Amino acid sequence: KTVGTKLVLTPQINEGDSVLLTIEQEVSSVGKQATGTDGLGPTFDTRTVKNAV
Amino acid sequence: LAPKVVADERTNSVVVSGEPKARARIIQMVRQLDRELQSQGNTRVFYLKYGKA
């Protein structure tokens, strides 16, 4: 799984000025590369926002 | 036994078989429909600005 600063964006242009941006982004992390979990695999701190604007 | 009309789509050629009155009037009909398109075609392409194609 690719967890880091991700921007996935498909822009679409209004003939004149204003951009339609389909954004799926997040800032995510595996906590500490020397720390475990109460579960079973790695966990991730994510800040995500997927929207069209 | 009277004049008949044809065409080839490899050379795009009119073919006549008949009279010289048919040569005279079908050289007119060649010219009548040998008109090109004027800008606006059968097919258009719309550049959508806020909508996704």
mmCIF file of N, CA and C in Angstrom:
data_model
loop_
_atom_site.group_PDB
_atom_site.id
_atom_site.type_symbol
_atom_site.label_atom_id
_atom_site.label_comp_id
_atom_site.label_asym_id
_atom_site.label_seq_id
_atom_site.Cartn_x
_atom_site.Cartn_y
_atom_site.Cartn_z
ATOM 1 N N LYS A 1 0.861 -1.204 0.000
ATOM 2 C CA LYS A 1 0.000 0.000 0.000
ATOM 3 C C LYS A 1 0.888 1.241 0.000
ATOM 4 N N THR A 2 0.656 2.184 -0.909
ATOM 5 C CA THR A 2 1.409 3.462 -0.972
ATOM 6 C C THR A 2 0.784 4.451 0.015
ATOM 7 N N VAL A 3 1.430 4.642 1.167
ATOM 8 C CA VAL A 3 1.005 5.612 2.213
ATOM 9 C C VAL A 3 2.114 6.649 2.365
ATOM 10 N N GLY A 4 1.782 7.903 2.090
ATOM 11 C CA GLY A 4 2.680 9.060 2.206
ATOM 12 C C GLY A 4 1.902 10.291 1.836
ATOM 13 N N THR A 5 2.552 11.369 1.434
ATOM 14 C CA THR A 5 1.805 12.496 0.841
ATOM 15 C C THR A 5 1.395 12.066 -0.571
ATOM 16 N N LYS A 6 0.101 11.843 -0.788
ATOM 17 C CA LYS A 6 -0.435 11.474 -2.114
ATOM 18 C C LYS A 6 -1.369 12.562 -2.576
ATOM 19 N N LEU A 7 -1.223 12.870 -3.831
ATOM 20 C CA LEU A 7 -2.214 13.648 -4.558
ATOM 21 C C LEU A 7 -2.534 12.811 -5.773
ATOM 22 N N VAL A 8 -3.777 12.415 -5.908
ATOM 23 C CA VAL A 8 -4.230 11.833 -7.189
ATOM 24 C C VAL A 8 -5.216 12.808 -7.778
ATOM 25 N N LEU A 9 -4.922 13.345 -8.928
ATOM 26 C CA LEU A 9 -5.818 14.395 -9.405
ATOM 27 C C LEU A 9 -6.012 14.215 -10.896
ATOM 28 N N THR A 10 -7.265 14.297 -11.335
ATOM 29 C CA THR A 10 -7.661 14.372 -12.755
ATOM 30 C C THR A 10 -8.334 15.717 -12.958
ATOM 31 N N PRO A 11 -7.582 16.779 -13.291
ATOM 32 C CA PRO A 11 -8.181 18.039 -13.725
ATOM 33 C C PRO A 11 -8.968 18.007 -15.043
ATOM 34 N N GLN A 12 -9.932 18.919 -15.148
ATOM 35 C CA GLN A 12 -10.825 19.089 -16.321
ATOM 36 C C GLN A 12 -11.072 20.593 -16.489
ATOM 37 N N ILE A 13 -10.873 21.148 -17.685
ATOM 38 C CA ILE A 13 -10.798 22.626 -17.853
ATOM 39 C C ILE A 13 -12.088 23.173 -18.462
ATOM 40 N N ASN A 14 -12.696 24.147 -17.781
ATOM 41 C CA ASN A 14 -13.726 25.055 -18.354
ATOM 42 C C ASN A 14 -13.030 25.865 -19.452
ATOM 43 N N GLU A 15 -13.572 25.863 -20.675
ATOM 44 C CA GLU A 15 -13.049 26.588 -21.866
ATOM 45 C C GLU A 15 -12.200 27.798 -21.458
ATOM 46 N N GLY A 16 -12.670 28.602 -20.493
ATOM 47 C CA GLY A 16 -12.138 29.939 -20.131
ATOM 48 C C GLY A 16 -11.135 29.966 -18.974
ATOM 49 N N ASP A 17 -11.557 29.665 -17.739
ATOM 50 C CA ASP A 17 -10.725 29.888 -16.526
ATOM 51 C C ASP A 17 -10.775 28.679 -15.597
ATOM 52 N N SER A 18 -11.964 28.373 -15.102
ATOM 53 C CA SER A 18 -12.158 27.638 -13.834
ATOM 54 C C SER A 18 -11.988 26.125 -14.015
ATOM 55 N N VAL A 19 -11.121 25.553 -13.186
ATOM 56 C CA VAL A 19 -10.755 24.114 -13.247
ATOM 57 C C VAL A 19 -11.714 23.296 -12.387
ATOM 58 N N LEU A 20 -12.293 22.229 -12.949
ATOM 59 C CA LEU A 20 -12.926 21.123 -12.182
ATOM 60 C C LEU A 20 -11.811 20.161 -11.787
ATOM 61 N N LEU A 21 -11.583 19.991 -10.490
ATOM 62 C CA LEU A 21 -10.515 19.122 -9.952
ATOM 63 C C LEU A 21 -11.145 17.937 -9.248
ATOM 64 N N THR A 22 -10.960 16.729 -9.757
ATOM 65 C CA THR A 22 -11.355 15.521 -9.008
ATOM 66 C C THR A 22 -10.157 15.114 -8.168
ATOM 67 N N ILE A 23 -10.256 15.314 -6.860
ATOM 68 C CA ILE A 23 -9.127 15.092 -5.922
ATOM 69 C C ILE A 23 -9.433 13.856 -5.087
ATOM 70 N N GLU A 24 -8.456 12.974 -4.989
ATOM 71 C CA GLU A 24 -8.394 11.951 -3.928
ATOM 72 C C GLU A 24 -7.021 12.108 -3.295
ATOM 73 N N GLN A 25 -6.943 12.661 -2.094
ATOM 74 C CA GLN A 25 -5.633 12.869 -1.442
ATOM 75 C C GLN A 25 -5.711 12.497 0.029
ATOM 76 N N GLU A 26 -4.543 12.310 0.608
ATOM 77 C CA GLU A 26 -4.448 12.032 2.042
ATOM 78 C C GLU A 26 -3.005 12.217 2.474
ATOM 79 N N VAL A 27 -2.817 12.490 3.747
ATOM 80 C CA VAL A 27 -1.487 12.434 4.385
ATOM 81 C C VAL A 27 -1.573 11.322 5.411
ATOM 82 N N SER A 28 -0.930 10.207 5.120
ATOM 83 C CA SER A 28 -1.084 8.998 5.943
ATOM 84 C C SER A 28 0.282 8.453 6.329
ATOM 85 N N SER A 29 0.319 7.656 7.383
ATOM 86 C CA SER A 29 1.589 7.246 8.010
ATOM 87 C C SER A 29 1.370 5.936 8.742
ATOM 88 N N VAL A 30 2.436 5.171 8.894
ATOM 89 C CA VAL A 30 2.405 3.872 9.609
ATOM 90 C C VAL A 30 2.819 4.112 11.069
ATOM 91 N N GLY A 31 2.271 5.142 11.717
ATOM 92 C CA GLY A 31 2.708 5.561 13.062
ATOM 93 C C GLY A 31 4.233 5.608 13.162
ATOM 94 N N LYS A 32 4.848 4.633 13.854
ATOM 95 C CA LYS A 32 6.323 4.508 14.062
ATOM 96 C C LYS A 32 6.838 3.193 13.448
ATOM 97 N N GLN A 33 7.866 3.266 12.592
ATOM 98 C CA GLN A 33 8.511 2.102 11.913
ATOM 99 C C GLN A 33 9.145 1.137 12.929
ATOM 100 N N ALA A 34 9.024 1.408 14.239
ATOM 101 C CA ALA A 34 9.557 0.559 15.339
ATOM 102 C C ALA A 34 8.491 0.331 16.425
ATOM 103 N N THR A 35 7.220 0.616 16.101
ATOM 104 C CA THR A 35 6.030 0.510 16.994
ATOM 105 C C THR A 35 5.016 -0.483 16.404
ATOM 106 N N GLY A 36 4.346 -1.242 17.275
ATOM 107 C CA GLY A 36 3.314 -2.223 16.890
ATOM 108 C C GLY A 36 1.918 -1.615 16.849
ATOM 109 N N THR A 37 0.912 -2.487 16.935
ATOM 110 C CA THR A 37 -0.535 -2.169 16.856
ATOM 111 C C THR A 37 -1.256 -3.049 17.898
ATOM 112 N N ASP A 38 -2.478 -2.702 18.346
ATOM 113 C CA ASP A 38 -3.323 -3.612 19.180
ATOM 114 C C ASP A 38 -3.960 -4.689 18.293
ATOM 115 N N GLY A 39 -4.024 -4.432 16.987
ATOM 116 C CA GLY A 39 -4.475 -5.391 15.962
ATOM 117 C C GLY A 39 -3.355 -6.282 15.447
ATOM 118 N N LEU A 40 -3.233 -6.417 14.124
ATOM 119 C CA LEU A 40 -2.481 -7.538 13.509
ATOM 120 C C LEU A 40 -1.524 -7.048 12.421
ATOM 121 N N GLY A 41 -1.976 -6.205 11.495
ATOM 122 C CA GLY A 41 -1.103 -5.580 10.483
ATOM 123 C C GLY A 41 -0.633 -4.193 10.913
ATOM 124 N N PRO A 42 -0.012 -3.418 10.001
ATOM 125 C CA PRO A 42 0.298 -2.016 10.268
ATOM 126 C C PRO A 42 -0.962 -1.145 10.282
ATOM 127 N N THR A 43 -0.957 -0.027 11.007
ATOM 128 C CA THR A 43 -2.069 0.960 10.995
ATOM 129 C C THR A 43 -1.628 2.263 10.344
ATOM 130 N N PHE A 44 -2.568 3.118 9.969
ATOM 131 C CA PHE A 44 -2.213 4.356 9.250
ATOM 132 C C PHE A 44 -2.942 5.556 9.812
ATOM 133 N N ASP A 45 -2.206 6.628 10.100
ATOM 134 C CA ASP A 45 -2.808 7.955 10.349
ATOM 135 C C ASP A 45 -2.952 8.665 9.007
ATOM 136 N N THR A 46 -4.190 8.883 8.606
ATOM 137 C CA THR A 46 -4.499 9.438 7.282
ATOM 138 C C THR A 46 -5.280 10.721 7.462
ATOM 139 N N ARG A 47 -5.010 11.662 6.580
ATOM 140 C CA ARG A 47 -5.886 12.825 6.382
ATOM 141 C C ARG A 47 -6.211 12.883 4.907
ATOM 142 N N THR A 48 -7.467 12.657 4.622
ATOM 143 C CA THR A 48 -7.901 12.323 3.276
ATOM 144 C C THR A 48 -8.961 13.307 2.887
ATOM 145 N N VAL A 49 -9.092 13.523 1.616
ATOM 146 C CA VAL A 49 -10.258 14.274 1.144
ATOM 147 C C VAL A 49 -10.336 13.898 -0.307
ATOM 148 N N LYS A 50 -11.433 13.263 -0.692
ATOM 149 C CA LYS A 50 -11.720 12.959 -2.104
ATOM 150 C C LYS A 50 -12.997 13.685 -2.468
ATOM 151 N N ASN A 51 -12.870 14.622 -3.384
ATOM 152 C CA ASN A 51 -14.017 15.425 -3.838
ATOM 153 C C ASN A 51 -13.713 15.955 -5.226
ATOM 154 N N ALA A 52 -14.764 16.326 -5.921
ATOM 155 C CA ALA A 52 -14.620 17.237 -7.056
ATOM 156 C C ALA A 52 -14.953 18.631 -6.547
ATOM 157 N N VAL A 53 -14.122 19.569 -6.956
ATOM 158 C CA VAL A 53 -14.255 21.016 -6.655
ATOM 159 C C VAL A 53 -14.083 21.746 -7.977
ATOM 160 N N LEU B 1 -33.283 0.753 -73.171
ATOM 161 C CA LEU B 1 -32.314 1.287 -74.180
ATOM 162 C C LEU B 1 -32.008 2.770 -73.919
ATOM 163 N N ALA B 2 -32.555 3.353 -72.850
ATOM 164 C CA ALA B 2 -32.430 4.791 -72.521
ATOM 165 C C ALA B 2 -31.320 4.989 -71.488
ATOM 166 N N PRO B 3 -30.793 6.227 -71.332
ATOM 167 C CA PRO B 3 -29.675 6.518 -70.423
ATOM 168 C C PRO B 3 -29.810 6.088 -68.950
ATOM 169 N N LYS B 4 -28.755 5.486 -68.382
ATOM 170 C CA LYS B 4 -28.721 5.007 -66.970
ATOM 171 C C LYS B 4 -27.556 5.665 -66.212
ATOM 172 N N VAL B 5 -27.630 5.636 -64.874
ATOM 173 C CA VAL B 5 -26.717 6.372 -63.950
ATOM 174 C C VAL B 5 -26.034 5.404 -62.982
ATOM 175 N N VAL B 6 -24.784 5.715 -62.621
ATOM 176 C CA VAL B 6 -23.883 4.850 -61.804
ATOM 177 C C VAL B 6 -22.884 5.734 -61.068
ATOM 178 N N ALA B 7 -22.058 5.096 -60.232
ATOM 179 C CA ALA B 7 -20.847 5.688 -59.624
ATOM 180 C C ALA B 7 -19.873 4.626 -59.096
ATOM 181 N N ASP B 8 -18.608 5.039 -58.969
ATOM 182 C CA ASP B 8 -17.478 4.329 -58.311
ATOM 183 C C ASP B 8 -17.129 5.092 -57.036
ATOM 184 N N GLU B 9 -16.870 4.378 -55.941
ATOM 185 C CA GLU B 9 -16.494 5.002 -54.650
ATOM 186 C C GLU B 9 -14.978 4.832 -54.403
ATOM 187 N N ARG B 10 -14.235 4.137 -55.283
ATOM 188 C CA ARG B 10 -12.744 4.026 -55.200
ATOM 189 C C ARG B 10 -12.102 5.319 -55.727
ATOM 190 N N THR B 11 -12.568 5.833 -56.876
ATOM 191 C CA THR B 11 -12.093 7.108 -57.493
ATOM 192 C C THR B 11 -13.074 8.249 -57.169
ATOM 193 N N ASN B 12 -14.239 7.899 -56.599
ATOM 194 C CA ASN B 12 -15.487 8.721 -56.529
ATOM 195 C C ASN B 12 -15.767 9.333 -57.899
ATOM 196 N N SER B 13 -16.186 8.491 -58.833
ATOM 197 C CA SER B 13 -16.444 8.903 -60.229
ATOM 198 C C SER B 13 -17.906 8.654 -60.578
ATOM 199 N N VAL B 14 -18.563 9.639 -61.177
ATOM 200 C CA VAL B 14 -19.895 9.371 -61.770
ATOM 201 C C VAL B 14 -19.660 8.581 -63.043
ATOM 202 N N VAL B 15 -20.583 7.675 -63.270
ATOM 203 C CA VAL B 15 -20.631 6.877 -64.510
ATOM 204 C C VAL B 15 -22.005 7.117 -65.111
ATOM 205 N N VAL B 16 -22.022 7.509 -66.376
ATOM 206 C CA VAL B 16 -23.265 7.605 -67.182
ATOM 207 C C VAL B 16 -23.196 6.503 -68.232
ATOM 208 N N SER B 17 -24.336 5.966 -68.648
ATOM 209 C CA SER B 17 -24.420 5.117 -69.862
ATOM 210 C C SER B 17 -25.617 5.572 -70.696
ATOM 211 N N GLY B 18 -25.402 6.360 -71.758
ATOM 212 C CA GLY B 18 -26.531 6.792 -72.607
ATOM 213 C C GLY B 18 -26.226 7.918 -73.583
ATOM 214 N N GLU B 19 -27.316 8.560 -74.033
ATOM 215 C CA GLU B 19 -27.439 9.739 -74.944
ATOM 216 C C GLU B 19 -26.407 10.832 -74.677
ATOM 217 N N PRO B 20 -26.104 11.693 -75.675
ATOM 218 C CA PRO B 20 -25.435 12.962 -75.391
ATOM 219 C C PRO B 20 -26.301 14.037 -74.711
ATOM 220 N N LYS B 21 -27.629 13.931 -74.800
ATOM 221 C CA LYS B 21 -28.540 14.742 -73.954
ATOM 222 C C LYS B 21 -28.353 14.305 -72.498
ATOM 223 N N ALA B 22 -28.070 13.019 -72.255
ATOM 224 C CA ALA B 22 -27.745 12.487 -70.911
ATOM 225 C C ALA B 22 -26.348 12.965 -70.497
ATOM 226 N N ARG B 23 -25.360 12.957 -71.404
ATOM 227 C CA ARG B 23 -24.033 13.579 -71.141
ATOM 228 C C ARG B 23 -24.259 15.033 -70.724
ATOM 229 N N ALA B 24 -25.042 15.777 -71.507
ATOM 230 C CA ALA B 24 -25.313 17.214 -71.278
ATOM 231 C C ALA B 24 -25.989 17.420 -69.915
ATOM 232 N N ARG B 25 -27.049 16.669 -69.582
ATOM 233 C CA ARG B 25 -27.852 16.899 -68.345
ATOM 234 C C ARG B 25 -27.237 16.184 -67.134
ATOM 235 N N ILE B 26 -26.444 15.133 -67.321
ATOM 236 C CA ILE B 26 -25.877 14.431 -66.140
ATOM 237 C C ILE B 26 -24.508 15.020 -65.808
ATOM 238 N N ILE B 27 -23.846 15.713 -66.732
ATOM 239 C CA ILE B 27 -22.687 16.571 -66.356
ATOM 240 C C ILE B 27 -23.218 17.719 -65.484
ATOM 241 N N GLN B 28 -24.457 18.169 -65.698
ATOM 242 C CA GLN B 28 -25.142 19.148 -64.811
ATOM 243 C C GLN B 28 -25.396 18.502 -63.443
ATOM 244 N N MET B 29 -25.875 17.257 -63.404
ATOM 245 C CA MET B 29 -26.228 16.574 -62.126
ATOM 246 C C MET B 29 -24.959 16.183 -61.342
ATOM 247 N N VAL B 30 -23.867 15.870 -62.045
ATOM 248 C CA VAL B 30 -22.492 15.752 -61.477
ATOM 249 C C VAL B 30 -22.196 17.024 -60.690
ATOM 250 N N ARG B 31 -22.404 18.184 -61.314
ATOM 251 C CA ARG B 31 -22.021 19.513 -60.779
ATOM 252 C C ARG B 31 -22.993 19.918 -59.670
ATOM 253 N N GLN B 32 -24.256 19.514 -59.779
ATOM 254 C CA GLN B 32 -25.318 19.878 -58.806
ATOM 255 C C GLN B 32 -24.982 19.331 -57.411
ATOM 256 N N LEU B 33 -24.396 18.137 -57.338
ATOM 257 C CA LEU B 33 -24.197 17.405 -56.062
ATOM 258 C C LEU B 33 -22.715 17.261 -55.736
ATOM 259 N N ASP B 34 -21.838 17.832 -56.559
ATOM 260 C CA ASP B 34 -20.371 17.849 -56.342
ATOM 261 C C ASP B 34 -20.059 18.998 -55.387
ATOM 262 N N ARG B 35 -21.081 19.549 -54.738
ATOM 263 C CA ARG B 35 -20.891 20.599 -53.714
ATOM 264 C C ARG B 35 -20.256 19.983 -52.464
ATOM 265 N N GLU B 36 -19.343 20.742 -51.865
ATOM 266 C CA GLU B 36 -18.615 20.410 -50.622
ATOM 267 C C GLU B 36 -19.495 20.767 -49.424
ATOM 268 N N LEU B 37 -19.078 20.414 -48.207
ATOM 269 C CA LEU B 37 -19.784 20.867 -46.981
ATOM 270 C C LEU B 37 -19.343 22.299 -46.684
ATOM 271 N N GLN B 38 -20.220 23.078 -46.066
ATOM 272 C CA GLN B 38 -19.894 24.461 -45.654
ATOM 273 C C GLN B 38 -19.695 24.474 -44.142
ATOM 274 N N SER B 39 -18.441 24.445 -43.681
ATOM 275 C CA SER B 39 -18.083 24.531 -42.245
ATOM 276 C C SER B 39 -18.880 23.474 -41.466
ATOM 277 N N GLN B 40 -20.097 23.808 -41.009
ATOM 278 C CA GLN B 40 -20.995 22.889 -40.252
ATOM 279 C C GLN B 40 -21.095 21.565 -41.016
ATOM 280 N N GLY B 41 -20.719 20.456 -40.379
ATOM 281 C CA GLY B 41 -20.716 19.125 -41.012
ATOM 282 C C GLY B 41 -21.898 18.277 -40.577
ATOM 283 N N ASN B 42 -21.821 16.971 -40.835
ATOM 284 C CA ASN B 42 -22.763 15.977 -40.262
ATOM 285 C C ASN B 42 -22.334 15.766 -38.809
ATOM 286 N N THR B 43 -21.033 15.645 -38.559
ATOM 287 C CA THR B 43 -20.510 15.438 -37.191
ATOM 288 C C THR B 43 -19.879 16.707 -36.633
ATOM 289 N N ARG B 44 -20.216 16.999 -35.384
ATOM 290 C CA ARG B 44 -19.615 18.092 -34.587
ATOM 291 C C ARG B 44 -18.820 17.491 -33.431
ATOM 292 N N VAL B 45 -17.875 18.244 -32.893
ATOM 293 C CA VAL B 45 -17.285 17.895 -31.581
ATOM 294 C C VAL B 45 -17.549 19.048 -30.629
ATOM 295 N N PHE B 46 -18.299 18.772 -29.565
ATOM 296 C CA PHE B 46 -18.535 19.707 -28.440
ATOM 297 C C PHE B 46 -17.426 19.577 -27.417
ATOM 298 N N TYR B 47 -16.781 20.703 -27.175
ATOM 299 C CA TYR B 47 -15.819 20.873 -26.076
ATOM 300 C C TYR B 47 -16.650 21.164 -24.830
ATOM 301 N N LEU B 48 -16.817 20.179 -23.964
ATOM 302 C CA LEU B 48 -17.586 20.421 -22.730
ATOM 303 C C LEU B 48 -16.665 21.111 -21.737
ATOM 304 N N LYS B 49 -17.196 22.083 -21.005
ATOM 305 C CA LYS B 49 -16.371 22.848 -20.042
ATOM 306 C C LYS B 49 -16.532 22.326 -18.602
ATOM 307 N N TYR B 50 -17.748 22.200 -18.061
ATOM 308 C CA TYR B 50 -17.997 21.807 -16.651
ATOM 309 C C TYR B 50 -18.457 20.343 -16.575
ATOM 310 N N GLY B 51 -18.891 19.780 -17.710
ATOM 311 C CA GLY B 51 -19.347 18.378 -17.844
ATOM 312 C C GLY B 51 -18.244 17.461 -18.354
ATOM 313 N N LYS B 52 -18.213 16.202 -17.899
ATOM 314 C CA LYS B 52 -17.177 15.189 -18.250
ATOM 315 C C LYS B 52 -17.661 14.337 -19.417
ATOM 316 N N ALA B 53 -16.870 14.217 -20.476
ATOM 317 C CA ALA B 53 -17.330 13.660 -21.763
ATOM 318 C C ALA B 53 -17.759 12.195 -21.581
#
